[PDB]
Amino acid sequence: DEDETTALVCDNGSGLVKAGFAGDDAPRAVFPSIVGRPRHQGVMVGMGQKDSYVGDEAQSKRGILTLKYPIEHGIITNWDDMEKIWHHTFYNELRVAPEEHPTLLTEAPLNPKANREKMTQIMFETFNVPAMYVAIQAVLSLYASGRTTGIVLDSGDGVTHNVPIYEGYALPHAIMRLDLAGRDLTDYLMKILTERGYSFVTTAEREIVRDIKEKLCYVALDFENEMATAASSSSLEKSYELPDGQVITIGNERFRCPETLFQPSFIGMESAGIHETTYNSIMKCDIDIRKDLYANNVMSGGTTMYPGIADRMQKEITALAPSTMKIKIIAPPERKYSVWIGGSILASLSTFQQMWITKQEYDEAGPSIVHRKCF
Amino acid sequence: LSDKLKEAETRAEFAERSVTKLEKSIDDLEDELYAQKLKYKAISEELDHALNDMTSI
Numbered sequence A: 001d002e003d004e005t006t007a008l009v010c011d012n013g014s015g016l017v018k019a020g021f022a023g024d025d026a027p028r029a030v031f032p033s034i035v036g037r038p039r040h041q042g043v044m045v046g047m048g049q050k051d052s053y054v055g056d057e058a059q060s061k062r063g064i065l066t067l068k069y070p071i072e073h074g075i076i077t078n079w080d081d082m083e084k085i086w087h088h089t090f091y092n093e094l095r096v097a098p099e100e101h102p103t104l105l106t107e108a109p110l111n112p113k114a115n116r117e118k119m120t121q122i123m124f125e126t127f128n129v130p131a132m133y134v135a136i137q138a139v140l141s142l143y144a145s146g147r148t149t150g151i152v153l154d155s156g157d158g159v160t161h162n163v164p165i166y167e168g169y170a171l172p173h174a175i176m177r178l179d180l181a182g183r184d185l186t187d188y189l190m191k192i193l194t195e196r197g198y199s200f201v202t203t204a205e206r207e208i209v210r211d212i213k214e215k216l217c218y219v220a221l222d223f224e225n226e227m228a229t230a231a232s233s234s235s236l237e238k239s240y241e242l243p244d245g246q247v248i249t250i251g252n253e254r255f256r257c258p259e260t261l262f263q264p265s266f267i268g269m270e271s272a273g274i275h276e277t278t279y280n281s282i283m284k285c286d287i288d289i290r291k292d293l294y295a296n297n298v299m300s301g302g303t304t305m306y307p308g309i310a311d312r313m314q315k316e317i318t319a320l321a322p323s324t325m326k327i328k329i330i331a332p333p334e335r336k337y338s339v340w341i342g343g344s345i346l347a348s349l350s351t352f353q354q355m356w357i358t359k360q361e362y363d364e365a366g367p368s369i370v371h372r373k374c375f
Numbered sequence B: 001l002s003d004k005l006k007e008a009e010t011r012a013e014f015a016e017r018s019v020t021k022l023e024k025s026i027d028d029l030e031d032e033l034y035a036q037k038l039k040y041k042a043i044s045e046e047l048d049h050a051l052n053d054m055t056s057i
């Protein structure tokens, strides 16, 4: 299927795995990060004895399979799910073995050392891979953006990373990760819908309402004013049609769901909102480059697909920062895949072909030394 | 009774032919409606996507 000896770019982002060959502009195999294990034991004869579903095979059946998240906040919980999702991506979709081409994986900023050593060991010992490389997502996203300056805000599913890069320079001391993202928003919407009257307590419905949020939920331009005008609703409340057919009616809750990002007090945490944390990060940077960080801020992550985030960011930053300079916020189209796109354009360089880590040096050095070599 | 039985068998066979033809007719109508309803659902989902694209401005 592939006639070019190039690394397979597999972005294992929290919530959605995006795998594809280098050189492509979009991932071909896109599936959620979920593992469905058989809950009961059947006396039936003939069905697949497979004890571990994955991807679309699990999405197609969520009532029988108890759903487990292979990644939580960033820390890898179960490694069997890791081996399952890579083995599946290798021998069920791509139809190619890892013994013929490299593999450029993308990991989140500020992750545990155990996670890195574990994935590297599974990719070297178990699977025979000629070479591995771990890369931070923020750099590849800035590559795909086509710039060298700005602060990347990557909001995945269970973690949110703010990474400032000015003049193509990383700042490992300022990268601050906060576990507020799509899962805590799904939980907030679920508890407020339970407050509305429709109560559910199973994961399949949780994924359904997550999809409903992805499709409908947006960000408000003025929270309190929308609350007042929605008190007497007319066009502000919408009636959604569940894929099963049950008629759901959702009004203001939509534009109050992502608001939890701006007010973490809703989930009883002393952490500051994403905008205030980004602002504090900007103060932690130097003054000289702060204006450039204001003018080149970039966004990444699937959570940014909601309509109305750019305007909300502009008003909040204008209210926090002075209103004398110019603070333009740029969001490139299809930003979610941009990271992966970067991977593709990063795997075609010959120099990058010279910066890989082969098996033998890793085996003698050991995983810890490999951690030192990368950084 | 032989004459009556022959008549009865002829009419029963006619009714069997009728039920068979109606079964094919309903199966075809059901398939056509399934296709149209899928078209409508796709139209609705694409319209929702469009609506979020305009709200994104």
Ligand SMILES: Nc1ncnc2c1ncn2[C@@H]1O[C@H](COP(=O)(O)OP(=O)(O)O)[C@@H](O)[C@H]1O
Binding pocket: A011, A013, A014, A015, A016, A154, A155, A156, A157, A158, A181, A182, A183, A210, A213, A214, A215, A300, A301, A302, A303, A304, A305, A306, A335, A336, A337, A339
């Ligand atoms: N099309 C979409 N619309 C709205 N939200 C989305 C969409 N796709 C993904 N998300 C949200 O983004 C999160 C997953 O993001 P992720 O795939 O990790 O981004 P990235 O791959 O850029 O790191 C989930 O919480 C999900 O709710």
Ligand SMILES: [Mg+2]
Binding pocket: A013, A154, A155, A156, A157, A300, A301, A302
């Ligand atoms: Mg992300």
